[PDB]
Amino acid sequence: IQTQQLHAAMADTFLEHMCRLDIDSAPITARNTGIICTIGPASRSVETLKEMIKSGMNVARMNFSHGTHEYHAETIKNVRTATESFASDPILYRPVAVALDTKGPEIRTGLIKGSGTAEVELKKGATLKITLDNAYMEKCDENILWLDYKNICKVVDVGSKVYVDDGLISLQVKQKGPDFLVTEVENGGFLGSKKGVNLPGAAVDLPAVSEKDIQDLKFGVEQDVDMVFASFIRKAADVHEVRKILGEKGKNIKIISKIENHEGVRRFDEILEASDGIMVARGDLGIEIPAEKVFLAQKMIIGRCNRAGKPVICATQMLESMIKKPRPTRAEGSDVANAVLDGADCIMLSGETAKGDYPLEAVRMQHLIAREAEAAMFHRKLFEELARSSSHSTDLMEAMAMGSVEASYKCLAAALIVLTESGRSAHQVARYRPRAPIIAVTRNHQTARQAHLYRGIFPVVCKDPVQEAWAEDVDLRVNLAMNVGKARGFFKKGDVVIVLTGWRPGSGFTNTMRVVPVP
Amino acid sequence: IQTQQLHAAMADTFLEHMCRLDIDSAPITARNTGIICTIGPASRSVETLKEMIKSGMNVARMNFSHGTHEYHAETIKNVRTATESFASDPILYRPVAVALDTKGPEIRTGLIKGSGTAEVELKKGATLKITLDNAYMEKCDENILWLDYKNICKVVDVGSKVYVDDGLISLQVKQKGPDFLVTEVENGGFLGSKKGVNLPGAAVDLPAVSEKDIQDLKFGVEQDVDMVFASFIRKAADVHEVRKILGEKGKNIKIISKIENHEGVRRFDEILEASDGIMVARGDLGIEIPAEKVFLAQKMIIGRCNRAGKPVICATQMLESMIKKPRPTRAEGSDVANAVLDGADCIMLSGETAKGDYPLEAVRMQHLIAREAEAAMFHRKLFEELARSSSHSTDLMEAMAMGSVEASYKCLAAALIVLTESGRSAHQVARYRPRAPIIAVTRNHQTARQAHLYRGIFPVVCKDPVQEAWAEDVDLRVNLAMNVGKARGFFKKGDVVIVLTGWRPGSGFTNTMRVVPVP
Amino acid sequence: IQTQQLHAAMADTFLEHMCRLDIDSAPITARNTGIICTIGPASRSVETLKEMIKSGMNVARMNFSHGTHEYHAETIKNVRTATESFASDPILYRPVAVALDTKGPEIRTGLIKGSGTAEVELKKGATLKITLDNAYMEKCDENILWLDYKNICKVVDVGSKVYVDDGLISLQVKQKGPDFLVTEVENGGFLGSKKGVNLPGAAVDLPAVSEKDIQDLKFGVEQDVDMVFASFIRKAADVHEVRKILGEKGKNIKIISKIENHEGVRRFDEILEASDGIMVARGDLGIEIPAEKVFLAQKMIIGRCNRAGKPVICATQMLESMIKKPRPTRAEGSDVANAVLDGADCIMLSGETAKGDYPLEAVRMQHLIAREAEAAMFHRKLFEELARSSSHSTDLMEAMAMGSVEASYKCLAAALIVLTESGRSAHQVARYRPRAPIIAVTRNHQTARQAHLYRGIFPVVCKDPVQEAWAEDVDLRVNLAMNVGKARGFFKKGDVVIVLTGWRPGSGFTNTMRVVPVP
């Protein structure tokens, strides 16, 4: 009984590949797919944060949607505190990224009967008037609804729908004025105060960044985050807007755009080009677009990013059930796996870690599935498809990347060691999707932490100073990776590994590739 | 914007195929995936049952693990009643299949406070006693739980873990008694009636066919079911025995082996060979085996049945969130869409329709996701991969099927019309997976009911009496199909369609293929 | 029992396909690739004609660059004589096409000693005078060499090179005047009559359609030729021009454009688009362009026509040897084979039949090699690729063809019988390259003759009156095929066949496909 789906790995067709999957075919210890965990009341503590890390947490996500700078900073604190607890063991030390998730643009209704707690009941088939007249900003009721978005009538059309409260309530536009909309309740319910609005199929003129947004980003810069997850991206311009706010001080910050609506989907191509990475924000996306289309968009986005060699994140409701239970649903297990099969660089946990009763279990779970799904990929076919995709480019690093992955397959390397500072070298490899783990040694901590954004990248921070001999310095770094994979159980002495390095100190890339034996 | 993902249909590569999936690409009216609904308390009603038919249900599932024969015979009548209510119009009548789900070698709980619909809430950390004392078999509660399995004590040990209800609840043995076990709730949860008990890693020697199984099966024959879903099939032998119990009288009833344990996976090959079809039974499966391995088994199984040309069903917890909510989760929408992509012939609903709060929704949602996933298939690679797999075969009807599918792809016909009595011809078409709808006109009722097990087959009962001239008869049936297609919105006058008929009466199969325009 | 490379037909890769070709794997009786024979002095005879047809000859080419209208008219005569000589038994009657090969924009020497059958030896180093002196026109010889081109002196420099007879002889201009050219013979060789002059890389302003061309054209129209090999076609305009001269009376004469220069190649596409088919005239072509590049043209050109669905011919020096030897060279046998594998619908013989010592042997040799090569094709992949190409198209007859061919493979049918009058349904099928024979039954003689242009089509001429009853009439025709197939030894009883017919009369195409057993 081969391991890691090697038997199916040898299939000629996709169909054969499937038919060959084996539950008895064990997968390697190394889990390539990054796990992004939203931190919160459930996970905030150091102790817990220690467990989250132990459990497989790679990225700590800061949902700026709620809480104060003072709160988040405290979370970041703890995170940093928890991470460092292992530093004492440079070998057993594991980098953990910090991400900032923007509240983003928002539409909100007014107060019901001047009360924040009151409710009304909209009944299907009834008429309801939307006004922009702040005269009613606190006089919302069964007949009149006031909202935050002054330009609404400009972007919505008669016959269009207005969704209130996470799509709970649906409204159909029957009449449009410059100051109001006359709608018809399709999907009734109780209406509370200050509920969210969604304008499915609308090309919303809200700014790329709210005022709050600007503030958080600056904050994130001051906090030294590793990336930013930018809510509500609808076009390249919006990405540019964010870039602009982070500016020169935060030019090294990774901007991940969140695809959450039709527009975003339709203008994905430009958005992708302008971004550093993508996040398939299923939550809103599923609210914005028909829930039955989400998958299409998910696979489209994943394929496109894989094609472009840009990091992609699958997020939202992956293990939903797990907020309350220690074991997920079958669909849940399915979802995580397909996600990984799709080509997703990272997978995410929101509610599950933030507030749920089983944060660690969610993490462990994700870890478990990802590993299995990872072996189950059809690498040969994939590499081949990818290569074709990129045929247009004759880049050297890529060539190095292609050659090295091909070799890792050929001799079934146990790992791929890449020495990089910027991490470009390592990114080039990950994109070609080896099956083996990519152990990347860098002296740049931020590069290290950011690596997580990429599939198969296992960052190892070199905390030593530079030697007078390049050669030696390189050898050392290599050895480091060697003690790690060993310490991690990725391999043992005798195993073979692909080693990538820069010929000289001003090489520019890992131009030197070598097949080597573990000590 | 092209329809039915036809742009992505032109993809050369799988990677490319994925990249071109467009949410703005609208599916067709026809939904190829059969929808199987478990009928129960929530769905038993004739009014309701009428609703579900309209919403899309193709097969009525009755679980003999719950209720009674009479409970079941009543439901069966209601389905039949509901169904025939449409028999009137020979163009809007939807054949609806009936299926019996066996108990098999399983361990089951008692009744909760004397009810088959009542439940109780367990509390993490609480103690719970399992009793064999038949005195409580109807008095199960939060303090005491009665089991089916009298030997339970010999096959368990202190510290052993007992799972209840597809792993929902985890009990850990604390105390062994001669008549009982004092357990501990390891996790909070709602305990319902007659729930499965799973003892992973325990010697449970139950027979493939129990005396009770004998009665249900015979009852199913008397009930004139169309197929049996055979729980916990473990070897071809089990299957043979079932066929044996159904004997001559129920020789035409379809046997669907349910895969839900290690053994069933392991001996899958021998199981498929002997069955009429398979079910991926995820509920039990995922608790028997590692939850993380499910998708593997799921995928292996579906490739295998696809390869084999035998009907496969994906089931359980597919729209799980919908038992309580009116919208499914993101993992849920994915699951369903991936099962279709995986190649499942039918998908299924359990608690969702049997006892949930939103039975019709659950249905329409499956329906929605299904048409979408359908269009998203990569038919060209698929077909190619299928052809290949059945290379060794040289069958005449296979030949007719492949040429039929092939040309349908080519001229993009609106459907394939197939004249069949055994349903053999149609099935052979469905295995080659065309995009278009297969409309199978038959005078044989069971065939028509039975057809739903096969992808894309929309069965049409020709009620007209056999014409004395082959030609007119054939023509007669074609018109019937032509009319249903038009009525059902499958196509319009001018559309092009592929027609499979016999040259002569008693030709044996559809050896006649023509491309015909709609009238 | 190995036959028709069926084992190789099952390879997954092009490599494995190769690796599996078995010499011991016997080919079927049916030779797919048409054999075109250049009818000359050596094959004019009725008695010789009889044996060649017998030998596998499907088409006769009458080269206008040689002879007089009268010599060619007799040849036709004899051709048709030896042909209908077989009209006795319509089961074994084999049609033969009559092809007019044009002069074109060419330079041609004159009569060697008023002969034309006369030859002359030229020694290396010797001297030869090119003259425009008509009084030598028919008096060429070792000393004196007359030519077609009165401007040649303007188009050539001293030191330059003059090619005679497809580059057979290299003449270097030593000195030139107004009237003549003074050259020294660069390589020895037999200089014959009405030879070809190639002034490679020289601005010849020849006209696309000589008045003589015109003359001949009109002549062949009266001759009732089925096709035309238009020599030296350089651009679509030339085609239209030939098309032009063919005018109405010959709106059905197939125009086969010959690519024998750098321009023809370069303007291939529009040429192709305008012409009914193409010939790869390597004799002239190989001297017009570097000898080392012809195979690139051949492959590009054969590939393109395949793609287009237009008949292509491989022509010139295939079995050169054989003009003097009874057995061809290794290189020549590879050539015919490779040409067949390339995709050529037809193959040609030139000197081999027209003047060679072993006309009959050469023919049979083509027959022999073709068969063997037809089997060696990788039908699987080829069909997929062919479809990849035709993918934009949704033509109905095309869908028929494809499904038909697809079926043919599946059930290893012994043949496909097509009933056609225009012949298109048959070409449509031919183009999809089935391994099996196409028995194309028609009541159109010209159709039957022209069918030889397309690969695998075996033309059968139905001589019987029309049936009042379509069915009978169709049947009959089908019967015809059956008998002929039987008589030809294509199949026996119980063999499977694919039947292509039209549902009704004037169906515009075969819309009805049926799988049948031989009677």
Ligand SMILES: Nc1ncnc2c1ncn2[C@@H]1O[C@H](COP(=O)(O)OP(=O)(O)OP(=O)(O)O)[C@@H](O)[C@H]1O
């Ligand atoms: N006929 C019925 N009467 C009462 N409750 C039912 C009935 N059918 C289903 N249910 C309820 O719905 C739940 C899920 O239905 P399902 O048919 O999938 O049962 P199950 O317990 O999961 O076992 P299986 O493994 O056999 O499917 C059952 O556990 C039971 O609580």
Ligand SMILES: Nc1ncnc2c1ncn2[C@@H]1O[C@H](COP(=O)(O)OP(=O)(O)OP(=O)(O)O)[C@@H](O)[C@H]1O
């Ligand atoms: N009608 C003919 N009469 C006599 N000899 C002929 C005749 N046709 C062909 N031949 C001889 O056969 C040789 C090869 O025949 P072919 O038809 O290929 O002519 P060619 O000169 O090579 O012209 P092309 O380029 O057109 O093929 C001719 O060059 C000629 O010597």
Ligand SMILES: O=C([O-])C(=O)[O-]
């Ligand atoms: O913002 C998100 O993550 C979402 O909507 O899923």
Ligand SMILES: O=C([O-])C(=O)[O-]
């Ligand atoms: O029995 C079933 O359907 C299951 O367990 O999924």
Ligand SMILES: O=C([O-])C(=O)[O-]
């Ligand atoms: O005419 C030809 O065949 C040639 O020139 O090769």
Ligand SMILES: [Mg+2]
């Ligand atoms: Mg969001």
Ligand SMILES: [Mg+2]
């Ligand atoms: Mg169940």
Ligand SMILES: [Mg+2]
């Ligand atoms: Mg079960």
Ligand SMILES: [Mg+2]
């Ligand atoms: Mg020529």
Ligand SMILES: [Mg+2]
């Ligand atoms: Mg020649």
Ligand code: NA
């Ligand atoms: Na956020």
Ligand code: NA
């Ligand atoms: Na059951």
Ligand code: NA
């Ligand atoms: Na010529």
